[PDB]
């Protein structure tokens, strides 16, 4: 069909992608419904000539990138959400996820039709609408009763701590202030992990923050490692816009101009991943087989790999002895504790000795001109959710520090990231490590709030969680429905009494009902970026403002303002009861807009008279304002900000550690021991009992829990059910083929998937889409966690049983190769 072009004078605002870490820059064009731009280039806002065919690469523009929104005043506007060609992050690229933004904006008839737009209450064994005031009276009423009788230990949360949509500096501050400073509860987990902890404890403790470089570094590297990472699918436009140009030779002249006395061989790439992925396939396509190494490790053997590599580089002297001497502690000890021969490393990991030696030679042997290769070490959930998070990072960082691959351009040892980041919160208010799902399963807590997450789909050991929460919720449902004519006070009492008899009151604060609606008693409508202003940063710390351009559905609210509403409701109740001390805990939420939360949190960190604030913006965050970010555009500024003035704008920081001052007591990077212990017993027990490694993770097309995707007809046609990639010989043995349904099960749970034969999958290994709306992978993940309560989500084994042939999947779903050749 056809597209309505933006008029030359259409309104244009800046929007960062809602979704992944990379934080691609976009423009939103908004104009009245019945107006349209001309085809001539100066008569539309795109500046493109639609009077004749456009050349390739000229535009990213499909109908899915357009919509028509209806504002609260009833006025209808065209919108068009398209990538910004001048943004340095993406240079005009759009992934398939961010490309759907316009479709996932709220409209009454489109993909956002089922957005929450009113408070919802489960009462009298049914979902109904309720008023905001009533919702707040019930929720604040229960929180007050709980604080008064049980203390904060009775009030539980699982809340986002991320950036982008359903996070960001405003939102993490508002929620954090509410949970930690006002309620003061320690009973808080994070959207992606079941305790209040870091993904990167070991690296941070060693002195190296996990976002320590620029995306430009990937362009300057001689070698890139991708460790536990599938970046074409999970950090698409970083891979496309920065990594692949390096592999293609497009950045060679830049390297040579920066470093006139240094050789730059063709760039090479090394993947550490048990599974062969789309990312490996494309790297081989672009660079050739001889420039790519896939270290197809046995699951969970990363620590053995890095200790072998570290041992080898030290034996070869392919280290930076002056750097070690001047800027590190603990090297000699780590050499002893982490000793592992290449033979033993090979035997454990399954990687041939020759491939281990080649990886080390490409990465760490000095170049002919004398300098060490610039090797950027990138890692994500294959080790963060790997076999003992803390230990793997200890082992990896040891190898990086010894080879001076932090602080030089074209280097880094960095997370690839998941969501964007946008953390500003008060300190966590205890010193205990608390496994929240286990406490809920054991019957603790009076009230649980899921806030911008859906652990029904995403917890580890998820089936046990669902079973418990459904049971405890039903106790409350049964008690509430016996009420007749109950006032708020009476109903709060009924609920509290049920929670003394095993019940749990459950609230969800979300864009959509989700699966949580099967258990929740109360749901509150939130707003996403574009319905609200929002700040957050990408995987090179580049902070941008996403600008409001439309209204939220109904009475949906920015999460920081929901937090303020709850706090003010609690304050008012305490004031009414003459409890001045408790009322004072709830001060400081006089917020009318999300910029008020940015001012109160991010911009107050480290300032005179401010309380303790842990912020990714640091003490110079006050230099950032929305107006200054707006002026910076979608290029924003890399944090930390160094300076601001009118003439220069915001000026930031490209790379960390360039002078070798690390984030430790003595300014030195600290080596750590990395013991190799095998798989944890809980995991090994499943592996001993069951046949298949149940690897799990991302698909390029699907975003997270498919909260928008579940409503997208193209998405549902392609992926009607979660899929499991399986080795063809394994499939033959089980008499399955593409589009059959299997049950996947072990001691922890059972789930279901559509079979997806993939040639490159190893016998006895599988890969299932995580987090989905039709067949939840997490049911088979174990309860095992590392010392800081980080789950080994990637570490579980199970059996597979044929259910049968799903005719419609066979007729409608492609089971062709997603790995490009």
């Amino acid at each position: 069909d056809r597209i309505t072009l933006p008029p030359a004078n259409a309104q244009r605002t800046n929007m960062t992608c809602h979704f992944c870490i990379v934080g691609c820059g976009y423009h939103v064009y908004k104009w009245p419904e019945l107006q349209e731009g001309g085809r001539a280039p100066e008569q539309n806002a795109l500046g493109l000539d639609f009077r004749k065919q456009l050349p390739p690469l000229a535009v990213t523009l499909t109908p899915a990138m357009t919509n028509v929104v209806t504002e609260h005043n009833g006025r209808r506007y065209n919108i068009m959400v398209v990538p910004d060609k001048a943004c340095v992050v993406n240079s005009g690229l759009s992934s398939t996820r961010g490309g759907k933004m316009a479709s996932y904006m709220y409209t009454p008839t489109g993909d956002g039709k089922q957005r929450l737009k009113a408070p919802r209450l489960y009462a009298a064994d049914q979902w109904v609408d309720t008023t905001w005031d009533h919702a707040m009276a019930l929720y604040a009423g229960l929180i007050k009763k709980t604080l008064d009788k049980d203390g904060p230990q009775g009030v539980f949360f699982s809340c986002f701590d991320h950036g982008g949509a359903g996070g960001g500096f405003e939102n993490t501050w508002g929620t954090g202030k509410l949970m930690f400073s006002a309620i003061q509860t320690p009973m808080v987990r994070i959207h992606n992990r079941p305790a209040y902890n870091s993904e990167c404890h070991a690296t941070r403790e060693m002195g190296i923050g996990e976002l320590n470089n620029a995306y430009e570094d990937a362009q300057l590297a001689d070698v890139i490692w991708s460790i536990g990472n599938n970046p074409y699918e999970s950090q698409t436009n970083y891979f496309l816009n920065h990594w692949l140009p390096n592999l293609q030779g497009a950045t060679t002249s830049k390297k040579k101009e920066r470093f006139p006395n240094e050789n730059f061989p063709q760039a090479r790439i090394i993947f550490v991943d048990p599974r062969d992925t789309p990312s490996v396939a494309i790297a081989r396509h672009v660079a050739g087989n001889d420039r790519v190494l896939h270290l197809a490790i046995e699951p969970g053997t990363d620590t053995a790999l890095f200790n072998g590599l570290f041992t080898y580089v030290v034996e070869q002297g392919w280290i930076d002895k002056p750097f070690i001497e001047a800027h590190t502690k603990g090297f000699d000890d780590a050499v002893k504790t982490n000793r592992l021969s290449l033979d033993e490393c090979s035997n454990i990991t399954g990687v041939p000795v020759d491939m281990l030696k080649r990886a080390a030679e490409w990465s760490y042997k000095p170049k002919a001109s004398g300098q060490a290769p610039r090797t950027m070490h990138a890692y994500e959930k294959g080790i963060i959710w790997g076999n003992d998070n803390y230990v793997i990072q200890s082992a990896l960082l040891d190898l990086v520090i010894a080879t001076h691959n932090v602080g030089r351009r074209g280097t880094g040892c960095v997370r690839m990231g998941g969501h964007q980041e946008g953390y500003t919160r008060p300190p966590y208010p205890g010193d205990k490590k608390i496994y929240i799902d286990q406490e809920l399963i054991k019957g603790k807590g009076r009230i649980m709030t899921w806030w911008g997450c859906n652990n029904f789909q995403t917890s580890n050991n998820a089936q046990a969680l669902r079973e418990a929460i459904l049971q405890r919720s039903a106790i409350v449902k049964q008690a509430m429905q016996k009420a007749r004519g109950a006032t708020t006070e009476e109903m709060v009492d009924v609920i509290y009494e049920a929670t003394q008899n095993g019940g749990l009151f459950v609230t969800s604060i979300n864009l959509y009902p989700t699966k949580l609606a099967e258990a929740a008693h109360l749901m509150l409508p939130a707003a996403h970026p574009g319905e609200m202003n929002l700040t957050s940063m990408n995987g090179e710390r580049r902070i941008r403002l996403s600008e409001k351009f439309m209204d939220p559905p109904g009475t949906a609210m920015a999460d920081c303002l929901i937090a303020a509403r709850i706090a003010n409701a609690l304050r008012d109740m305490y004031q009414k009861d003459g409890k001045a001390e408790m009322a004072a805990q709830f001060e400081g939420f006089d917020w009318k807009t999300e910029e008020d939360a940015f001012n109160d949190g991010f911009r107050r960190a480290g300032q005179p008279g401010a309380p303790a604030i842990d912020s990714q913006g640091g003490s110079t965050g006050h230099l950032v304002t929305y107006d200054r970010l707006r002026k910076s555009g979608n290029n924003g500024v890399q944090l930390p900000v160094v300076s601001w003035d009118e003439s220069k704008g915001l000026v930031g920081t490209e790379m960390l550690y360039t002078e070798g001052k690390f984030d430790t007591d003595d300014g030195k990077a600290h080596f750590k021991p990395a013991p190799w212990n095998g798989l944890p017993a809980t995991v090994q027990q499943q592996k001993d009992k069951y046949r298949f490694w149940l690897n799990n993770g991302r698909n390029n097309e699907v975003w997270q829990t498919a909260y928008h995707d579940q409503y997208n007809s193209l998405m549902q046609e392609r992926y009607p059910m979660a899929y499991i990639e399986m080795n063809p010989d394994d499939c033959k043995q089980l008499d399955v083929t593409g589009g059959d349904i299997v049950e996947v099960y072990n001691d922890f749970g059972s789930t279901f998937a559509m079979v997806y034969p993939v040639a490159e999958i190893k016998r006895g290994q599988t890969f299932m889409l995580f987090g989905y709306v039709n067949g939840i992978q997490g049911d088979v993940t174990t309860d095992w966690t590392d010392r800081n309560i980080i789950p080994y989500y990637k570490g579980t084994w199970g059996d597979i049983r044929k259910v049968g042939s799903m005719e419609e999947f066979k007729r409608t779903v492609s089971f062709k190769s997603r790995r490009f050749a």
Partner: protein
């Protein structure tokens, strides 16, 4: 009026097509490259006596690079950012960066003459405000 005026462009006659040997043609104008193929086994929107002849725009719906037709896998493959589309599933994106399936060229099959004629497009071709410029 709500509809574009698409030309009726003769492609060839059905018996001249060999199984899995694609034919290149332009439609609905010379700046719009397309492929037709007789797949040899029935599919979806397949025409002809064996309900197996399909056609597509070959411009990738991501950013417009021309795709190549892999006769063996019955897929269209984009070399720019690695999207692939299934010719046997009405252009379904198998994997990649696009937000629209590969546009299908609607074919009339006329038993009386054996002719295959392109008569419309389902989906919006890359790089244009409307399929008919």
């Amino acid at each position: 009026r709500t509809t574009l005026q698409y030309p009726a462009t003769q492609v060839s006659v059905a018996k001249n097509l060999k199984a899995n040997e694609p034919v290149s043609f332009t439609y609905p104008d010379t700046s719009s490259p397309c492929v037709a193929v007789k797949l040899g086994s029935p599919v979806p929107g397949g025409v002809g006596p064996n309900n197996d002849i399909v056609a597509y725009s070959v411009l990738c719906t991501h950013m417009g690079c021309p795709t190549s037709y892999d006769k063996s896998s019955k897929t269209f493959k984009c070399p720019c950012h690695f999207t692939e589309f299934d010719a046997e599933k009405a252009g379904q994106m198998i994997c990649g960066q696009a937000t629209e399936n590969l546009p299908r060229v609607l074919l009339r099959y006329d038993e009386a003459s054996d002719a295959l004629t392109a008569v419309g497009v389902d989906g919006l071709i890359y790089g244009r405000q409307a399929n008919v410029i």
